[PDB]
Amino acid sequence: DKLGPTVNPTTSDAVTFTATVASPDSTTAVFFTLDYGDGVTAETTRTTTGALSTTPTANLVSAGTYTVTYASIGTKFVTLRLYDSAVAPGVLLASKTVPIYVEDSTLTATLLQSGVPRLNLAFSGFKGRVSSSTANRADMWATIQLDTAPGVFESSRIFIGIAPTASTNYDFVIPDQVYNLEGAKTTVLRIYDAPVGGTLLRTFTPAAANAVYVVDPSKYVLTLTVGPTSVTTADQVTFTQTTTEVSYSASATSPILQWRFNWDDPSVVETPLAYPDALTAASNFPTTATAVSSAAASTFRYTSTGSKNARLRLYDGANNVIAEKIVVITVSNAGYTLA
């Protein structure tokens, strides 16, 4: 395997290799050599192995100089080859080949998630930028892959476009994709040159807490408890912002979602989108019940004598609510009488 950088290597970085050798049949000494896809660069010599046996032996590149810097980007076929004797040609016992993808350093690819992807429900709030450093670039395809789990597979090839000129960013739309883990994911946006096979050009990474997280809307529980219900148009309903507790109750590490409340009365516009109490932007949503605001107390009087749906909902990014709690309030004007 490639012991070097976990990400697909670029031209400059240069890779190291792990290759354990075992032998459940016999415990003798053999000599190994390493061909590289670009054989011009290097042609390793035959070095001795010891014992081997059923257990794998930490071998090959321990403190060696087998690291090779590639020149062309593409798929290179590294070739371990074992020989019995240290004379040319000897006897080739086995030869395992491994492909190593080397990407282009010039091309850049960034993934944006507009909103928080919900569970089950299809999430379309994705977007991709591809800034090419070269002047002219050929047509290019991309493949979203939701997770690194074995069950989930790479999607179909999407034709992102040409990116023909300059070093300007070229947005491409990404087709819908359904998640199902209700947990943290490792989204991978791969980019290919040709439609079928060809070569790998870039592989994006969630990159340290910008990872796609799947959220179950059912888990959220929000209480409203806003004043009375049967009061009349004269009486003022009291929003107690401290009493409205919002909690996720599924996992500790979830993204934050600004809340917003509506009276459902045309008189007053909806409340501004704000964060829960004593909580800043880009933090974990509280697993325990917490007020929407630290110290607030609203008083509202409904103008019209109808059924009012006082509704508090959570937004994030795009205006796509995941958690809404509505409460009905009725109004009557016939209770009064004068004589």
């Binding site: 030869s95 429900l121 299809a122 069950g151 597979f153 079928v196």
Partner: protein, 388 residues
């Protein structure tokens, strides 16, 4: 096989063999009189008096019978069948109607038929009967076995759809499905008929069933006709695994193990195998002598003065790499030798495409190369087609 249904009119077939003495092609046809008695006493009142063939061979002439002759279902019937020349096997067919249920014992006899007369027991020795296994008729279940039906002009509230359209199989769910991807969940009050896209490997026309493709082809999630795999490819269906919790959106049905999801499944053959066809369900090992190159459509014949063994000693052999077989396919396509070798000095190959004959046990008989001693008084300069 033992017990037939109660009231369904059951056909009975009896196979008769004439054994290696099969009447010659150049001859005249022979005829036999197969006669049976079911056991029921619905038709001509009483059962046959005795078991002997004498009474049996005079039951009724039933060889020709219309369905509505009132004899088409006779408990005891005798028919006459003919063997044409050049065939040994004969089938006797008797329709039987069982009015009531109960244990019955069918008695079958066979007689050689000649010149309108019935003969003796066609089986060796006289008065031997092949008594069928006594059965008890079971109830007759009603089940039409055709395709799916469709109801005409039935009222449905809003979303419920009797028939989805091409590339969307039918679903019964409350959730708000659009196209095949869903939009909202728990929108409709009750559950209703929606349409899903269908996963990659599958492809659906006229969608109630969402069918995976035959191995040859490969599909995309929402296509009408499943796409053909290229000539020099295999279309290996990637393992799908399964759903573990019964509360996770299923990709597809449960019996479905593997699917050919997308063009990437169409892997290309390793060196030494060619794939001419378009289906390409299995790659074809190139025949002896002929040599391939990567995913090949046709094997190229090895040139004169050369044979076909491994090429490990030589430089740049065209051998299949471990990657191309173990990693992509596994053990179904091992590494077979693929290259041409020059026979050494003082031997020559006049013909093209004779490979090195192998041996499956080495310590018993050793394998060699099919080049020739180069008749005396002549030499050859390593690989040559004619000795100088």
């Amino acid at each position: 096989p033992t017990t037939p249904y109660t009231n369904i009119p059951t056909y009975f077939t009896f196979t008769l063999l004439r054994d290696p003495p099969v009447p010659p092609s150049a001859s005249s046809g022979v005829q036999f009189a197969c006669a049976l008695y079911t056991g029921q006493n619905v038709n001509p009142a009483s059962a046959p008096s005795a078991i002997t063939d004498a009474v049996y061979k005079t039951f009724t002439d039933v060889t020709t019978a219309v369905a509505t002759d009132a004899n088409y279902f006779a408990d005891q019937q005798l028919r006459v069948v003919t063997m044409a020349p050049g065939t040994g096997r004969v089938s006797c067919t008797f329709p039987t109607l069982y009015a009531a249920a109960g244990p019955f014992s069918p008695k079958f006899f066979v007689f050689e038929y000649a010149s309108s007369t019935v003969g003796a027991n066609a089986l060796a020795v006289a008065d031997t009967v092949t008594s069928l296994t006594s059965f008890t008729t079971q109830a007759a279940p009603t089940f039409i076995t055709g395709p799916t039906n469709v109801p005409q002009r039935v009222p449905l509230p809003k979303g419920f759809r009797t028939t989805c359209f091409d590339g969307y199989e039918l679903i019964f769910s409350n959730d708000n499905y659009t196209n095949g991807v869903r939009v909202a969940v728990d929108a409709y009050p009750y559950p209703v008929g929606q349409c899903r896209k269908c996963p990659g490997g599958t492809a659906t026309m006229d969608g109630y069933r969402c069918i995976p493709c035959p191995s040859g082809y490969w599909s995309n999630e929402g296509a009408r006709e499943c796409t053909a795999c290229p000539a020099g490819t295999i279309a290996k269906p990637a393992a799908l695994t399964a759903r573990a919790k019964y509360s996770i959106d299923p990709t597809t049905y449960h019996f479905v193990t593997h699917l050919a999801m997308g063009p990437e499944s169409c892997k290309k053959c390793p060196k030494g195998y060619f794939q001419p066809n378009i289906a390409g369900t299995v790659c074809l090992p190139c025949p002896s002598g002929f040599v391939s190159t990567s995913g090949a459509t046709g094997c190229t014949a090895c040139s004169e003065g050369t044979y076909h063994t491994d090429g490990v000693g030589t430089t740049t052999p065209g051998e299949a790499t471990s990657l191309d077989t173990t990693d992509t396919f596994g053990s179904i396509y091992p590494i077979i030798p693929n290259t041409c070798r020059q026979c050494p000095a003082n031997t020559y190959l006049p013909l093209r495409g004779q490979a090195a004959i192998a041996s499956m046990n080495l310590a018993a008989v050793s394998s060699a190369t099919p080049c020739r001693p180069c008749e005396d008084g002549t030499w050859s300069k390593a690989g040559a087609a004619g000795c100088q």
